[PDB]
Amino acid sequence: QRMLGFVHTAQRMPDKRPAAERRQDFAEIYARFSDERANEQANRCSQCGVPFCQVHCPVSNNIPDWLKLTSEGRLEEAYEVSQATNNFPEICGRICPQDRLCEGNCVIEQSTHGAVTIGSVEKYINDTAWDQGWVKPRTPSRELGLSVGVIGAGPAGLAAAEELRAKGYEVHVYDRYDRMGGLLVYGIPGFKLEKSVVERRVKLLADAGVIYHPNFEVGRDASLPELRRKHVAVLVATGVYKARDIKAPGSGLGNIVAALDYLTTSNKVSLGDTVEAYENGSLNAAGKHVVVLGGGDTAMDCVRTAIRQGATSVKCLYRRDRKNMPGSQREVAHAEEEGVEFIWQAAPEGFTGDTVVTGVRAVRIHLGVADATGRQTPQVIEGSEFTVQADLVIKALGFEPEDLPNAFDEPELKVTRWGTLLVDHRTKMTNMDGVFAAGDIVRGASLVVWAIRDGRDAAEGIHAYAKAKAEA
Numbered sequence: 101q102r103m104l105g106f107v108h109t110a111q112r113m114p115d116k117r118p119a120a121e122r123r124q125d126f127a128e129i130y131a132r133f134s135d136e137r138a139n140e141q142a143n144r145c146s147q148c149g150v151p152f153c154q155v156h157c158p159v160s161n162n163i164p165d166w167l168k169l170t171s172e173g174r175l176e177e178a179y180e181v182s183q184a185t186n187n188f189p190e191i192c193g194r195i196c197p198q199d200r201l202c203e204g205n206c207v208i209e210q211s212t213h214g215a216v217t218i219g220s221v222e223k224y225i226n227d228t229a230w231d232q233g234w235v236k237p238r239t240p241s242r243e244l245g246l247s248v249g250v251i252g253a254g255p256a257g258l259a260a261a262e263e264l265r266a267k268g269y270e271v272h273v274y275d276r277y278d279r280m281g282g283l284l285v286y287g288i289p290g291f292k293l294e295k296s297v298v299e300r301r302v303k304l305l306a307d308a309g310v311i312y313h314p315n316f317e318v319g320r321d322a323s324l325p326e327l328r329r330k331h332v333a334v335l336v337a338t339g340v341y342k343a344r345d346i347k348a349p350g351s352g353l354g355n356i357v358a359a360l361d362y363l364t365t366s367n368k369v370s371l372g373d374t375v376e377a378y379e380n381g382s383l384n385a386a387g388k389h390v391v392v393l394g395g396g397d398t399a400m401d402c403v404r405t406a407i408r409q410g411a412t413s414v415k416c417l418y419r420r421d422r423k424n425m426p427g428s429q430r431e432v433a434h435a436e437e438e439g440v441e442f443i444w445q446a447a448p449e450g451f452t453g454d455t456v457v458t459g460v461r462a463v464r465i466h467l468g469v470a471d472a473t474g475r476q477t478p479q480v481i482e483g484s485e486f487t488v489q490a491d492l493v494i495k496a497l498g499f500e501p502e503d504l505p506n507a508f509d510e511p512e513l514k515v516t517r518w519g520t521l522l523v524d525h526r527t528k529m530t531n532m533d534g535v536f537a538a539g540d541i542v543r544g545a546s547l548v549v550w551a552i553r554d555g556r557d558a559a560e561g562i563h564a565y566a567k568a569k570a571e572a
């Protein structure tokens with residue numbers, strides 16, 4: 101039908117399970133659209149000129165085109181259009197925060213008509229295509245005689261590997277873990293993204309012809325000059341893993357565990373491998389009171405994965421207001437509905453205890469009015485300082501890059517202050533010849549789709565450089 105039906109229809113997301121039932125299991129919380137409902141929700145588009153849904157999507161899919169090709173049957177052509185510009189569409193549709201990228205700037209969203217549910221239609225059109233064999237690996241026609249190396253198996257690494265293998269090269273990936281996929285499989289919990297689609301996509305990648313090297317750290321089992329001599333070009337996509345800390349009176353007691361360790365062990369125990377720290381360790385929250393520090397999406401993941409495993413009472417201390425939350429806002433409402441209690445504008449001061457933490461003494465800060473440059477300056481209130489009973493606290497402040505030049509044996513890699521190495525904009529080439537670096541280690545605490553775009557751009561640049569070098 102002529103697809104301008106936002107006038108006489110109302111937006112409604114797919115099926116959801118109630119809160120009293122969500123708290124038990126570890127599966128997802130949403131469901132896939134039905135056919136007659138997807139063909140209706142994809143019809144509310146307006147095919148507007150100058151589509152803001154595409155200007156603000158970091159990978160810049162052709163959103164109106166497959167929204168049209170979905171609203172008229174014709175699902176296979178829609179799958180083609182969607183896949184031809186994005187390597188992991190379903191993963192993006194599942195995890196990408198849409199209220200700030202695409203759904204937050206739709207033209208009918210700016211006019212209080214609600215937003216066309218884009219990511220859910222992405223999921224629908226990209227998963228119903230998987231069941232009927234419309235997905236196939238991109239095996240190169242004529243195998244080109246060159247070899248390219250990458251470091252890391254995250255989103256950027258896998259995207260670059262797929263692009264290079266499609267061009268015709270021979271790729272070799274080098275991941276530190278045993279199950280490749282990066283923090284897509286060890287950072288993000290199960291209820292957000294299921295660990296089955298990730299292994300499905302990595303199996304497809306391996307079927308395309310990629311060679312996998314698990315349990316292979318660059319620092320220990322290799323060296324950057326050796327790999328530089330092996331292949332023709334290497335892509336540093338190792339991400340950021342050196343976490344942050346806090347120095348306060350009482351910050352040396354027991355049961356003060358970093359967030360990444362907790363999340364990793366939760367992912368493992370959901371998969372298996374029977375780590376002992378889940379049996380006898382401080383990485384369980386069965387019958388304890390949990391308190392997490394800092395904000396962001398990491399805080400949301402931690403608090404939810406804690407409230408799933410019992411956790412008689414959970415609290416989260418953010419040191420700003422609610423509207424400045426770094427992550428999305430659907431997960432905040434989800435956590436509130438599931439049982440979490442939030443404490444906005446609070447900063448930790450100390451930990452009271454003897455050998456194990458018994459409580460967290462915190463202060464209450466006040467934010468000034470936005471400055472002429474758009475920056476609020478908080479100041480701690482002198483009177484109100486309080487203490488919360490805490491059985492297990494989790495520090496989830498942030499993440500920073502490691503010291504790569506002093507660990508990759510090459511002290512000539514140019515670096516900024518924070519650790520993100522410098523790189524040109526066009527070719528995505530590192531200071532040194534032959535080596536390239538693009539992904540999350542160049543940006544900071546970005547999202548997945550930015551990593552995908554950086555990986556694709558670095559792949560194109562590496563192809564151009566290798567062709568120009570073997571050319572003459």
Ligand SMILES: Cc1cc2nc3c(=O)[nH]c(=O)nc-3n(C[C@H](O)[C@H](O)[C@H](O)COP(=O)(O)OP(=O)(O)OC[C@H]3O[C@@H](n4cnc5c(N)ncnc54)[C@H](O)[C@@H]3O)c2cc1C
Nearest residue numbers: 195252253254256276282283318338339539540547548551
């Ligand atoms: C919805 C959402 C939720 C998010 N949740 C989180 C979250 O909970 N926590 C979080 O931290 N980020 C989170 N992010 C951020 C995002 O996941 C990452 O910034 C991004 O995925 C990292 O991209 P990358 O290319 O650096 O890959 P990464 O996955 O960051 O790359 C890590 C890989 O590098 C490998 N590696 C590391 N060091 C070495 C080495 N020396 N040698 C070899 N291999 C090495 C690791 O083993 C791993 O395979 C989230 C993003 C979104 C959109």
Ligand code: SF4
Nearest residue numbers: 145146153206207216
């Ligand atoms: S969601 Fe809105 S802006 Fe995006 S294509 Fe549809 S009508 Fe245009």
Ligand code: SF4
Nearest residue numbers: 157192196201202219
């Ligand atoms: S990748 Fe993210 S921003 Fe782009 S269309 Fe999909 S959900 Fe929207």
